[PDB]
Amino acid sequence: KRLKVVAAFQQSGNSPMGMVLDAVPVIPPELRPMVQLDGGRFATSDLNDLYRRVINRNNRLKRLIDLGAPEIIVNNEKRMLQESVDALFDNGRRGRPVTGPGNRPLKSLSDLLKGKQGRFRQNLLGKRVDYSGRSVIVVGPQLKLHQCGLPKLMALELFKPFVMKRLVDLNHAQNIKSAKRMVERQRPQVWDVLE
Amino acid sequence: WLSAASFQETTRVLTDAAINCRSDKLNGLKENVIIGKLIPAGTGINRYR
Amino acid sequence: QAITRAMADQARTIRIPVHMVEVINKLGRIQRELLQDLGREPTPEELAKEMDITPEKVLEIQQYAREPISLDQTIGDEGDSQLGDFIEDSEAVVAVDAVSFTLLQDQLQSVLDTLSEREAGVVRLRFGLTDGQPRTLDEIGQVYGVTRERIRQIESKTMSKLRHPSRSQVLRDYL
Amino acid sequence: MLDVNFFDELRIGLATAEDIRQWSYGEVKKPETINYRTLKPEKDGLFCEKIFGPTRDWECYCGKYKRVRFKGIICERCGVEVTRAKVRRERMGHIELA
Amino acid sequence: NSVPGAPNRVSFAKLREPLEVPGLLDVQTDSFEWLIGSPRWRESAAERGDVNPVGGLEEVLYELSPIEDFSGSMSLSFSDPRFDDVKAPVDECKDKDMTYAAPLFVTAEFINNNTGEIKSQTVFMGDFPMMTEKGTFIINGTERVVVSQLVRSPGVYFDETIDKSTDKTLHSVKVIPSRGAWLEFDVDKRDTVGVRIDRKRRQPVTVLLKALGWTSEQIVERFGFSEIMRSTLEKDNTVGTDEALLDIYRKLRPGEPPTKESAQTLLENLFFKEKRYDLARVGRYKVNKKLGLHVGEPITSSTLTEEDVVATIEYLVRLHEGQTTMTVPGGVEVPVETDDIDHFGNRRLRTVGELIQNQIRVGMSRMERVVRERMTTQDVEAITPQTLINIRPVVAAIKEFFGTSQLSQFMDQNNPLSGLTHKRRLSALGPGGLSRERAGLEVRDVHPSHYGRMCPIETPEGPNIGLIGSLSVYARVNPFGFIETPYRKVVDGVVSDEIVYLTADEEDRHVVAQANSPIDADGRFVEPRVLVRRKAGEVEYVPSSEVDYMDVSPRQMVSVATAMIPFLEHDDANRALMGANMQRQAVPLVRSEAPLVGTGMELRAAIDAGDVVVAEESGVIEEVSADYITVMHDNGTRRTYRMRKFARSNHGTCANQCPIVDAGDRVEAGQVIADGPCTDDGEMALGKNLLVAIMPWEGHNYEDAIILSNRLVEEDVLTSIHIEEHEIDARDTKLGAEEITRDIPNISDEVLADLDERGIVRIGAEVRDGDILVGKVTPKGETELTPEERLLRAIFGEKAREVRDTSLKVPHGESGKVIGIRVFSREDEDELPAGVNELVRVYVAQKRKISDGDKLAGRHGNKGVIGKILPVEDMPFLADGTPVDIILNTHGVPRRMNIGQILETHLGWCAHSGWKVDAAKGVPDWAARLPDELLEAQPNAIVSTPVFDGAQEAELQGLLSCTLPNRDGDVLVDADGKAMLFDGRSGEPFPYPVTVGYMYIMKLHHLVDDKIHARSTGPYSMITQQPLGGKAQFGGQRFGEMECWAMQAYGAAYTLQELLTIKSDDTVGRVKVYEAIVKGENIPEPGIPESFKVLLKELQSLCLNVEVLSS
Ligand SMILES: [Zn+2]
């Protein structure tokens, strides 16, 4: 058992210093955006909250140390820093999850990766696509094998730029923007050209 | 490690992936899928490409 | 005291000064008491009296009392999607504008070049489109060796002949 | 790191302090994100514009340079590099532990 | 019959009812009544358990009073939970978005125990929300429904398991009090006991009994024969009462120093104090019955005691010893039988009352916290009841319950049924409920203890199959809330009219008998061997005189929506589920034909639904009008009824209430005043009655595709009105305010044609998709004015137009006339929140004439979207020259056990043509036990058929004999059933006779006008550049991994690179392809996408350096 790790580190140019930590990354703020909803109401990713907790922990630990305090309180603060970084990397690993407002668990980095919600199985293994649509189906007996019925409006809003251009070079709309408004208003000309 | 970590126990496997300096070949099928590169199957192999 | 200051200035996701959060807490106190003192929620037009501050200040106080929310909390009846899933990146390129912006910029060359080249260059720096600095007519005198009033004359020579619909008919589709 | 999609081998490994502070564009030391009035990041706040770069495209903290003609220039008052707002996605920061 | 306005709906009933059908709103009504202190409940409680007529209000008030201080010198006590009148009527609160409610008041008692002072301060508690007669609470105006829940009655539930090592049968118990920490006693792999308390496995009962103040003495006075515990006291390895106490402490309060009294008093504070371990009152009662401890006493002291636990341990051990009667020394005996859960005897029913009083319990828990907080920091004699009480935690507690607690969900309303049957819902999920993934296979099952209690058929067919339940019809709500079902009891072969309510555990000491036997009316059974249910739920034969209980009557174990399917007994229980659930999804049409063939419950089930206006009081009909109907009571006064027309439903439909009354006719207490959206003559009517021929028509009704008679479309026989509202909210801003007028930036002429000046459409504006509905014009903001547009505004002469028009355009695929506007405003001096100066609700309706893709369905699960509808030209006709109503596919019928809809088909044929079963010389053999007046019928008639006690197959065979036609001489269905048809296309006959007859059909709320989404390119996600999800937002389609699998299996790599790179996530390429097919050029080489780069940022952000080597 201990071989599989000690040898792996021996061969690898990897120092088990990194397995203990003294500096922490800060993911780019947009990836943890502090975004405002329509009309002042905001929204955070709660990662900013974990960073807040760790920042305050370290700040007060310094304040004690910079001042020089009784030991046991410093021991408590140091454990608190351990806990805060633990949550940051993994909420809910040791002891209870770090629940926030209204008694709900928060989200940590290690959560962003797991299961049908983590990036792998939620946003890299499967993703949402433009130029697409969905509608109910009906039987298409009057078709041939290769042929498939298509709600014309669905086809239009699928084939939007194509019809845009095609009538633009038929000059039914001078420039592309005129054609965009044409399609939006759904003038008759867009239909034959859709065909 | 990328394929397995993109299969199950995302963290546990990622641990030893990090430990063992496992450089992924960036060549596997599911690899190409994630990285947005063309997969090595069907019309993706260099012979057809 | 330490807990008061620490909560006031460090327990807020968005740190607020002691005075503003102080009035906010005073509001949460006096209004919450006034609810029972009134048999009803105390109205803001009334709450503004007790602080002897204008109602608009009271409402700013309240609008700073409301706090940010979390982007990942479940929204569906079951847990299948988060709030962050409904948010739009405001910085998205419409990608019709971009193509149409290129078309604007190209119709610009096609129209300027069909105009005189002296004038085309005059405007290219007057509005400073190809550069970062729009220019005044006395900078143009060096580059074009003529009195600034002559560029005052040329600006209208551009615009009015442009104001012939021939240039306008092909450009009015660009809005 | 420039990523023109010419990739051969993806490496995963532990990161040291000399790596984390190597990636960062400063150290963040103040637990703040938003100004409740100016709605801006603070000096070394969790969204510090200086650290992660500008939000307003080609417009620094004081907007000493609000034009793309200034590009890459680091303002002499705030130090916010004048560049694209995309870096706030690209750049990252760090905290040093006591 | 037994109804003041019902028509004659003759049926084939076999027996009479010892009791009629109960009020079908008795799930919310009684619960809330008992919650309040209603005078009805005041008398009912003072006669059915008057030891404590106490609503949740009074009850919680008393469990809370009297709050003391840390010392006991000063205290506060409560009394008089008093109500007040509501703040406005139902629609008014809904009209102006207010929570229907009434104020509450209470009289405090500020008792300074030190010396004695009193303040009987009548403290305002807030505005407590109140219940409407329909049980539907209004929140902020919105209608919401509190669904009933099932839960575990707290206590000790003894269980058995295998060790699968020596195959020993081991026994344990879950000591389960409401608000209790776990303590687990069992016999382990060995014969010792595991006494692990709160999941900490050491210290068997030696730490337990000795720590009670005991030593081995009292223990061995009980455990000399208990070998399971003799070893424990022999493996004591320690001595001491306080020693066992500290061992608890070492295993229940470790991590903190002990002391000789800290555990010595902690073990009292844990279970023998009432502030951390308190099983419910009915829980105390349940155990009283389980172990037999208490047998004549009222309930108090939810805090755990000592007598119970000794009985518990001895029951566990004598079960491990496989005994038959454990009797803890000092009381009555009880048998040795394992404690089931899923048998309703242990599954109680937490209704609205319990939920609300519990939320109030916790609200006043925090209120007591604040009372004590302000009882100390505030000076003595400087404190009054008002200052002690923070009622915020009270009002919050309810509102946080009401708001955003899935036990208080949206009121669903697209038909009267979805209004009703949404109540009387017995949910399994929630706080105290079990989550779906935790909800295993067994719990989903239909326990034998559901008979009569829960509907065994009407369950959701999604992932909640078996979890969410619905009430029966005849069921009852217990004061405790344990399910109660009325039944007759056969005593010595005397099935009594006695309506004896029992729950499940009240069967295991009883025996329920067959429901429809040759009962001579003497109360005996003709045959000894009758199919009864034995105590364990076993259903077998038992002699006539031996069983003790008989059922009340058929359609007792069934719900209402299920009770609207004629021939349920001929329909697969599977498909019956589909039909019942679809009956909740019908859409409000404009006729609502009553079924020619239905069930007698429909008439009852409609008036009880409130969706039918009633003559609450008898007296003459003064007058009839479309806006009101005045019933002049015989005594001076009248009753004016103001009707509800074009009031949008909770699911965007109408609540139309048409009158079927006469200007002078006497109306009775309980007779219709107006039919509702899906009712006629006061019985439910969700659809229409249509002649059939299930011949498959040229592959357009193939595989669940349906073809209809186009008359029905041109007639709009099956067509639905669809109201909708777009909400337009203009708020306060630093840009200014979004002044809704007809000040439109850059607007043409034809687009203002049907618009009124005041910023909206003309009320009654025919509008369409994308049509501008409301001009919510906003200021635009800052931007660099492009030089081209600068030249334009210099060249043609238009203004900057610096206003951002955030108007409403009808989003994709909506249209129809505009109803009107509901506008509230700040200048109107209204209660708009801080900023919103205009709240607008414009209303657009469209009567969506049906089309293919719209989901229709019958009453037996037969369902599907319309494949096609051709004109009447090619419609085969009977020997009456008649093209038929409806044509379906046959192949669904054989493979789905669903000839039942054909059974109703044919009987509806008979009910449409009439019959006269010829009693020429004697009643025909079928006609004999076939009830009377079923020998007679005239064309175009209406009937019913009970779910299990209906028109048997042979009876129907007798209904075909006399097949007297409607008009011509045409007996088309022979005595055996089939009819003949001639094709309407060919004019040429089919080889075999073709089926016909009358089917009920209805339109389902799954329109292809609602379920289409298209997108070339909309907006994109926040973090990733990926699109969003939803039809509301332009959204975008999801391409999953499981699609990627086949996607590669095709080998189509380039298309997959397309999918994940540019079709999702490459910005510049997305513009490139825009550039490609705005340049009319082939889409060129793919780019490299953003979310992939966002993937990289995510990964780099993971405290691990990563660099892909090019080389
Ligand atoms: Zn600057």
What does this structure look like?
Chain A: It comes from Mycobacterium tuberculosis (strain ATCC 25618 / H37Rv). Chain A: Belongs to the RNA polymerase beta' chain family. Chain A: DNA-dependent RNA polymerase catalyzes the transcription of DNA into RNA using the four ribonucleoside triphosphates as substrates. Chain A: The RNAP catalytic core consists of 2 alpha, 1 beta, 1 beta' and 1 omega subunit. When a sigma factor is associated with the core the holoenzyme is formed, which can initiate transcription. Chain A: This is DNA-directed RNA polymerase subunit beta'. Chain A has 195 residues and is mainly alpha-helical. In chain A, 45% of the residues lie in helices and 8% in strands. Chain C contains nine helices and one strand. Chain C starts with a helix and ends with a helix. Chain E contains 27 helices and 52 strands. In chain E, the strands form 17 sheets. Chain E has a six-stranded mixed beta sheet with strand order 33-50-44-45-34-46. Chain E has a four-stranded antiparallel beta sheet with strand order 1-2-3-4. In chain E, strands 14-7-16-17 form a four-stranded mixed beta sheet. The longest helix of chain E has 25 residues, at 352-376. Classes of the chains: A mainly alpha (195), C mainly alpha (175), E alpha+beta (1111). Chains in contact: A-B, A-C, A-D, A-E, B-D, B-E, C-D, C-E, D-E. At the A-E interface, helix 4, strand 4, strand 5, helix 5 and helix 6 of A face strand 45, strand 51, strand 52, helix 24 and helix 26 of E. Strand 1 (23-26) of chain A pairs antiparallel with strand 2 (93-96) of chain D. The structure holds zinc ion. Zinc ion binds next to loops of chain D.
Percentage of residues in DSSP E strands of chain A? 5-15%
Helix count of chain C equals 9
N-to-C span of chain A: 68 Å
Helix content of chain A: 40-55%
> Biggest interface in this structure?
A-E, 53 and 69 residues
Characterize the largest beta sheet of chain C: strand count, sense, and whether it forms a barrel: none
What is the subunit organization of this protein? part of a larger assembly
- Decide which structural class fits the backbone of chain A: mainly alpha
The number of E-state strands of chain A comes to 5
Question: Residue share in helices of chain C?
Answer: 55-70%
The rounded Rg of chain A comes to 29 Å
Q: What can be said about the biggest beta sheet of chain A?
A: 2 strands, antiparallel
Tell me which ligands are bound.
zinc ion
Morphology of chain C: elongated
- Helix-strand pattern of chain C: HHHHEHHHHH
Q: Give the class of chain C from helix and strand content and strand pairing.
A: mainly alpha
Q: Give the SSE order of chain A as H and E letters.
A: HEEEHHHEEHHHH
* Overall geometry of chain A: elongated
Region (Sigma-70 factor domain-3) (chain C): 22-98
DNA-binding region (chain C): 137-156
Subcellular location (chain C): Cytoplasm
Function (chain C): Sigma factors are initiation factors that promote the attachment of RNA polymerase to specific initiation sites and are then released. This sigma factor is the primary sigma factor during exponential growth.
